[PDB]
Design a binder for this molecule. Sequence first.
Ligand code: HEA
Ligand SMILES: CCCCC/C=C\C/C=C/C/C=C/C/C=C\CCCC(=O)O[C@H](COC(=O)CCCCCCCCCCCCCCCCC)COP(=O)(O)OCCN
Ligand SMILES: CCCCCC/C=C\CCCCCCCCCC(=O)O[C@H](COC(=O)CCCCCCCCCCCCCCC)COP(=O)(O)OC[C@@H](O)CO
Ligand SMILES: CCCCCCCCCCO[C@@H]1O[C@H](CO)[C@@H](O[C@H]2O[C@H](CO)[C@@H](O)[C@H](O)[C@H]2O)[C@H](O)[C@H]1O
Ligand SMILES: CCCCCCCCCCO[C@@H]1O[C@H](CO)[C@@H](O[C@H]2O[C@H](CO)[C@@H](O)[C@H](O)[C@H]2O)[C@H](O)[C@H]1O
Ligand SMILES: C[C@H](CCC(=O)O)[C@H]1CC[C@H]2[C@@H]3[C@H](O)C[C@@H]4C[C@H](O)CC[C@]4(C)[C@H]3C[C@H](O)[C@]12C
Ligand code: CUA
Ligand SMILES: [Cu+2]
Ligand SMILES: [Mg+2]
Ligand code: NA
Ligand SMILES: [Zn+2]
Lengths: 514, 49, 227, 79, 73, 105, 144, 98, 43, 84, 58, 259, 46
Amino acid sequence: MFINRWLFSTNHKDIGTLYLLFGAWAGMVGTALSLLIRAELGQPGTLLGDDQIYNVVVTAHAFVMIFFMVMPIMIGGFGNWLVPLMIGAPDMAFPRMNNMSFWLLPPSFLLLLASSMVEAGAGTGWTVYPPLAGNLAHAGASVDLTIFSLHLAGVSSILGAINFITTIINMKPPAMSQYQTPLFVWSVMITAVLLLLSLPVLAAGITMLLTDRNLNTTFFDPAGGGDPILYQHLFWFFGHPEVYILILPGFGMISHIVTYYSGKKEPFGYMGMVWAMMSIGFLGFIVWAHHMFTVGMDVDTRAYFTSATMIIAIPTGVKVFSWLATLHGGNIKWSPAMMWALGFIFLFTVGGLTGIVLANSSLDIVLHDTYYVVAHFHYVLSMGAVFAIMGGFVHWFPLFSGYTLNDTWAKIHFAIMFVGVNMTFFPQHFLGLSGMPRRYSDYPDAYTMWNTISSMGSFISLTAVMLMVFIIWEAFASKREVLTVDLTTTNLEWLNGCPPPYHTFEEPTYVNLK
Amino acid sequence: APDFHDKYGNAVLASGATFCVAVWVYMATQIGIEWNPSPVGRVTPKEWR
Amino acid sequence: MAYPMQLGFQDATSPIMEELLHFHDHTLMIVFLISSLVLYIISLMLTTKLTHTSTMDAQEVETIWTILPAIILILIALPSLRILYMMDEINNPSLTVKTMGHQWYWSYEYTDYEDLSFDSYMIPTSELKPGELRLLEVDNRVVLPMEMTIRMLVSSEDVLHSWAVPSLGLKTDAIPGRLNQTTLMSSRPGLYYGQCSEICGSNHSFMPIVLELVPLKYFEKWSASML
Amino acid sequence: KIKNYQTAPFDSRFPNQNQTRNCWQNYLDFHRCEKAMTAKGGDVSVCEWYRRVYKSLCPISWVSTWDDRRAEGTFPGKI
Amino acid sequence: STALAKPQMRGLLARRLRFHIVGAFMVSLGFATFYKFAVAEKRKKAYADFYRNYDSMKDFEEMRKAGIFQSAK
Amino acid sequence: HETDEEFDARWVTYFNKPDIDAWELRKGMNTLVGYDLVPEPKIIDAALRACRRLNDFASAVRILEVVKDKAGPHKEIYPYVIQELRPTLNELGISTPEELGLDKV
Amino acid sequence: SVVKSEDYALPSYVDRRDYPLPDVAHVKNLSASQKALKEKEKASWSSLSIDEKVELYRLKFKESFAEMNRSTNEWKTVVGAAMFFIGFTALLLIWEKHYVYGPIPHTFEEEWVAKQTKRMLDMKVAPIQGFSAKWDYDKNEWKK
Amino acid sequence: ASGGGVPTDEEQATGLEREVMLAARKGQDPYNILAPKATSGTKEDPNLVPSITNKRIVGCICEEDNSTVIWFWLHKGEAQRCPSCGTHYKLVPHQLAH
Amino acid sequence: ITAKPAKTPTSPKEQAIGLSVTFLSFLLPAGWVLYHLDNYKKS
Amino acid sequence: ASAAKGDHGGTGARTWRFLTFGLALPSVALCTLNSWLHSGHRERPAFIPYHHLRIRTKPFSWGDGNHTFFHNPRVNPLPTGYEK
Amino acid sequence: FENRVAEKQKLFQEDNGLPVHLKGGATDNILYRVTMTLCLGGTLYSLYCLGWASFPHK
Amino acid sequence: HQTHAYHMVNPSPWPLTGALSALLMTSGLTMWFHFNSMTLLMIGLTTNMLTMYQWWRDVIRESTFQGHHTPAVQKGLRYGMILFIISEVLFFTGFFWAFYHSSLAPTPELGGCWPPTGIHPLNPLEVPLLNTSVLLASGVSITWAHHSLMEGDRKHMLQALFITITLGVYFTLLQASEYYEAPFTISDGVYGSTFFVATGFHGLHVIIGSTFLIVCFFRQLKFHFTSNHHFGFEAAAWYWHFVDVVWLFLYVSIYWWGS
Amino acid sequence: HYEEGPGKNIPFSVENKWRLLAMMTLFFGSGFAAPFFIVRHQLLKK
Ligand code: HEA
Ligand SMILES: CCCCC/C=C\C/C=C/C/C=C/C/C=C\CCCC(=O)O[C@H](COC(=O)CCCCCCCCCCCCCCCCC)COP(=O)(O)OCCN
Ligand SMILES: CCCCCC/C=C\CCCCCCCCCC(=O)O[C@H](COC(=O)CCCCCCCCCCCCCCC)COP(=O)(O)OC[C@@H](O)CO
Ligand SMILES: CCCCCCCCCCO[C@@H]1O[C@H](CO)[C@@H](O[C@H]2O[C@H](CO)[C@@H](O)[C@H](O)[C@H]2O)[C@H](O)[C@H]1O
Ligand SMILES: CCCCCCCCCCO[C@@H]1O[C@H](CO)[C@@H](O[C@H]2O[C@H](CO)[C@@H](O)[C@H](O)[C@H]2O)[C@H](O)[C@H]1O
Ligand SMILES: C[C@H](CCC(=O)O)[C@H]1CC[C@H]2[C@@H]3[C@H](O)C[C@@H]4C[C@H](O)CC[C@]4(C)[C@H]3C[C@H](O)[C@]12C
Ligand code: CUA
Ligand SMILES: [Cu+2]
Ligand SMILES: [Mg+2]
Ligand code: NA
Ligand SMILES: [Zn+2]
């Protein structure tokens, strides 16, 4: 029974729970790697070794946080648990292929851990540029094990995207149009279209890198007529949509959490929120060379990528102002999930505005490959994707488990993490404007003060991560069972009770046309 | 009936504040951390050549 | 170079860097203001017991939300793109210098007239002379004439690097098989520092750039003595 | 005329940051010229300009590799 | 005794919002007058004043005599 | 759409329906408090008389608490509304939340 | 009275200031005297005593508005405990400094810093605003 | 040119696929493929909600084009009303293998 | 939300134990490695 | 652009069968003749050890490491020239 | 050939509680065990190969 | 008992065996490229084949034999197959982008020209045009197969599908022969790299599509398809048109324009 | 069928809070420790 239920699952809730457990375990691995980065940098000199072991740790930090923590938790974990329930569907369209998206992740993570154990690791940056990642400067198996880890994560998510698109388009009640589905469901559908189109291009580029490293092709080697800059284009044609894939399901959860704790029946400006997520998904495919403003591209190309990149601020601003307008007039409930969402709105806005600074290619000449970029994306990733994940986890933990968290502890947890992440990242803006490069194991002495404080901040976020594990333990240890939840008339995923039965919607909802 | 906050709230606030300030001041000032502050107004420049 | 506790950009050594500082100030003001406008509306939404929870009409207010951001973006993009095209304008260099990135040091070639080239490596910390800067000094500096337009051409003989000097506003990647060009003009003599700016393996943190800007006649005699 | 050569001038055929083809074309033009001149008995000194320009722009290791390959019979450009 | 007067009862949230969005804008103008004056203008003036009578040869000679250069003693 | 008077008149009529049932009483008050206003005395009066036809004393009291709550920090509003309702409170024997001690935390 | 997990599909009671008249009464089962008080409620409310009115209110509702909206001391516990765990963090950092980090580089020695500072002033590091601008080259001292 | 040899669905469809095809022929919808059309929804003319059990979730799209759906359980017994628009629904339980 | 009282209440003392053991499970193994770094390197 | 055929007024298998045997397979038979005229070994070019060709940055994982996967002795020289 | 789909329909619909991947009878159990044994044994072998390759070789 | 039309699948080991096959094929390719051994890779190829076989067998049991493919299930599988084809189009797009990037701006190492110095392209009017005629023809014969099946004609469906698979095999044998005869290799700079990797992945998809058509041929022989329900055949026909269109773009781009 | 309800829809037991503490400690602790041991491994090799 155990093996049939948990290794052979065809059930969207249990597979969702598997993804949440996997993403939580990955989050401890990415957190340890982030503390090794900040231990190395927390005083001037060398702690670990030279930039090879250091950038192995920096490279694995990014891949684990992106591919093994954020994507599995937001799409595999909350997408699987919530999407079928929010549309009244009995499961995903392909419930058995769904379990293969999940099971391809432990082997992908194994390959990445094997990459770091064999030879000297892949110290390449999560962008894996050649020729540093090629077979002369990174001889031996590490970088091929990293490529294969990305192939397996890539297939897992392409098959997941097919499953979510099909399910969302095909398995709603026959009266429900796509403009009667909740915003979190729209966010998963758009993110799954971005995955379906972008991952195959990254799969093409890292396959080319694999054949340059093992079949004597020369896609990226000038000796054969190849070009290292072609790899960058193929990688970033995926890598920009990838950051919108990491944040979109977060925007979807934030819309629900803000609505719910404002005591509202619906988010402000629903069709403008759908329009904004479609426009961001669309524009997210025509901006990628803002990652390449120092590679030597022409002036008019740099003018076009500057402008198209800034344009994304228009639909993104619609969503920020619509979340404000959804709080407007609310009966505000200061739950811990609400605090995570308000922290999200403010910290995502800070990091989106430093993204606007960087879209100016002339200023990006000086800020590129410095810690100003690190600050920009950690404000949207550890204070946007992470805060939307912690908001949705505390909000829906009682639905998934049937038990309540202690809200006082969860507020304490939010307060410690908000102090730690701002102590960690805010000073990295000063380090970047004043010129500290990325991917450095050590720095000129003048950069000491801000690196010291940023490292002290990372330890405060470590204390928050340890406490979060205790908080989850305390909830399962005390077993306070949920009785009633507010606002079920506009939050269908709660209406089958906590936790819902293994099979829900065996009889579908009744929705008339009129 | 008074709950946990009514009974212990004042003590948790006072002691957590006291402890936090004491341990950060000690960490910042007593164990050899080199903050590397600006020399401006602090350092007397000395002949190097 | 950067100094301790520094918050903003290194002081400008070149007119283009000066333009970037004024443009950054223009932009950061916007940034300030939008972030504070948001923090503030937000605290306004959250600080009343009055409620209004019935359906709200979105049409009018969405006009404000798209138009005002669009205008603010145009107010940033106009000066941004003026600077972009200004730096691109033709400027007639008096000298061309090449630099090749290597693991882990830079070489320099000044071949307009003679065959002058040499390697430039970080000074190891244990060999710094008193007052020299850890991780920044080099054995052989990139001597150049002040107040003159110089074409720098940048490439690599192995993996990617990137040749940067933040006080001149410069960062051009060093790609093997490619020759990227940038122009450099210093308003002042002195020593201007930068650091390799694309991850390139074990000693990426340890291959800095030091430019030494001096009067033309000093540059000429230094050039002749380096043959 | 154009002694007082300082460096290679701006060339509107190669106005962008990537100057690889500028080095390459001047190297080709020089050697094509020198073959024309030392074929037809004439004077290589007429090729001097291309030589100055490619020497200024081209990395020493590229010139050196291209010269080794012309000598080996493996230079892939047409001269 | 006296009756209490009738107070405004309707649109209280909208009225509070109107009042404060205007106060929120007036900061932004007032802060924009700061910021600009304390940082941006101050920078333009520090650069203009520095270069107005700046002598680059004299700056070079001071550096050369302080022994900072490889190429010039 | 409509003037303030028309808004108020439609709500007075809603609660004045003689055979209004318990579900409609609850639907009306829980809808009405979603608006950006504190209901005028004449609306509350008709809701309190609907409570009386439905033999529901407690809901009359709760309606008076929700008027106070919809006023937020405008503390002059509720005492003015209770003043205006006193003839109806006396005629129906409705005690206010304060007279019942139900304002104590 | 007693809410059961197995009732989740049934209309339920809630105290919320934005849903003042919930879907069911807080108490539906009535004792003999409670049944008599519901009969009495059909007659004039002026004949109910204050205790009878309060008892009808408490059959219908669980908490009053003043009760369900009360402020609490929870913030003390949250802020205090957060400061505690922030304080505990500095223990970790004291431990790391004592047992993990070795000596920092000799370039932070006081005499080195004095010499490097003079050499930064001699090369006029950031002479417009950032560093040498703050040194008085006439009086040989930091500007006031 | 044109033997047969290819089975039709009438001959060879089986299991649920067959049940759906046989019911559609009768104009019946036991597996909820089609959206039900609303009645006027008054208490005398309530929307009638079939079910194989004693309760079923209703979603009420109160006005045409609303993006917000209002969801609630409908139980066997007296008609209930949508808590947003008041339109009436009544459960009509029971039996499937017709 | 409302919920039942805990079926298996976790007293202050039991929370202090769960919190201590959870913190030590992260601090001890990393602390052992970082403490012995000089041993790994000078080796 | 219609193309030049000219059908409809009913439909289906019969017409696509007609297209299969009356146009598609004839085209294949024709191209099969065209190919089987210009087939058979064309004389191999002087070997030149160009550095952009015969790339070897890592030995192949089969054979002696130096032969491509579908190496043809007659027309694929090695980095050092045509085999014996 | 003859159309024996009705025979297979009766086989796969027999009310014997078997999951579909085992419902064809004993040959499904055999092919399942062969597949699963190669997957799990191959996976142990891959871990062994990681252990081997994680250390410089003698 | 459900009263929706969707399919609750029985708990299945195949997702786990397929995920483990992936680990065994990738760690096996790593062993092969770096540790001189084919063992792990052959075990992963074998378990991947066994997994495909039993998983798709079970989908045929669930549909033809158990009746779970109602119209709503089939409509989902349509969307699934279309979205899969879109992702395979994007995968090829990356290799077309690599081809045009290198050929439109040929570097000095190539001689600054395309085709590079020393490359002698195949004549696009010889076997490449023959392969084009072969795959276009097989798009006409599969369309004949599809209309015969809809018209209930077993014998002509089988005859047209057999023709279509015979042309698939012909293109595969022609391409194998042209790879052997080609005077340039995958190691011949970015010309040989783009040529063999783009046409090589296309050839793999021709082999996959032909296999899928052969699966449809044996199910048709076993009478599984009705004249109205045959989604496996339609999916294989869409995937086969995809492989033909990709060939057309490769022919125009690499063999013709790039010659 | 399968067990349903709080504590029963998860692949780990919550029947005993101390045995649960041990399993959660091993689970999150092993993820957090792994990169320190990998770094140790990389340092020890060379
Ligand atoms: C969740 C992830 C995430 C998100 C959402 C974003 C959002 C944005 N990013 Fe970022 N970014 C990353 C993750 C993300 N980024 C990562 C990981 C990298 C580096 C990758 C690497 O090298 O490893 C990076 C790098 C990166 C670069 C390259 C810098 C360089 O390498 O030199 C640039 C340059 O344009 C950029 C710009 C932006 C912009 C304009 C947005 C915008 O989409 C933000 C739009 C949002 C707002 C603007 C805020 C809300 C709006 C309002 C309140 C309206 C009022 C506002 C205005 C009028 C402006 N990002
Ligand atoms: C005949 C029709 C075509 C079928 C091809 C037959 C052989 C292998 C099949 C796989 C085809 C896929 C492409 C992989 C790359 C290379 C193969 C290119 C096609 C090919 O077969 O190229 C041959 C080279 O093969 C070599 O190196 C062969 C090396 C074989 C190793 C395969 C490498 C593994 C690739 C990993 C793929 C990752 C997949 C990504 C999935 C993405 C996730 C979303 C050409 O021979 P040559 O002697 O150089 O020149 C001819 C000289 N007369
Ligand atoms: C060379 C070997 C190494 C590489 C591995 C791949 C090798 C070959 C694989 C060939 C693909 C064979 C697929 C066979 C599927 C048979 C199952 C099937 O076709 O199932 C059908 C459903 O379709 C369905 O699921 C449709 C599902 C089909 C999707 C499969 C097509 C492509 C998969 C390709 C894997 C791609 C690798 C990409 C390389 C980068 C069943 O419904 P019907 O047909 O309506 O029948 C019911 C009627 O009888 C009722 O009256
Ligand atoms: C980035 C995240 C890490 C944050 C910091 C971790 C805080 C440390 C928790 C304690 O870790 C322990 O510390 C002891 C020292 O206090 C070590 O004992 C060492 O030192 C003792 C005293 O010198 C000896 O008795 C022991 O044998 C010797 O192992 C012990 O091994 C290590 O587990
Ligand atoms: C029950 C389920 C299935 C699980 C099966 C597990 C099978 C385990 C068998 C491993 O033994 C072999 O050892 C060979 C050699 O001893 C190796 O080949 C390699 O070995 C050397 C390594 O270069 C060279 O001598 C060879 O050429 C090279 O092929 C290779 O590792 C493997 O074949
Ligand atoms: C024996 C069988 C009768 C089919 C049936 O109705 O069961 C027939 C009908 C169509 C036939 C097939 C098709 O005609 C196409 C092929 C033609 C070749 O000449 C022989 C094999 C070939 C693959 C045939 C074999 C066999 O004779 C088939 C399969
Ligand atoms: Cu050279 Cu980094
Ligand atoms: Cu981007
Ligand atoms: Mg870079
Ligand atoms: Na360091
Ligand atoms: Zn309704």
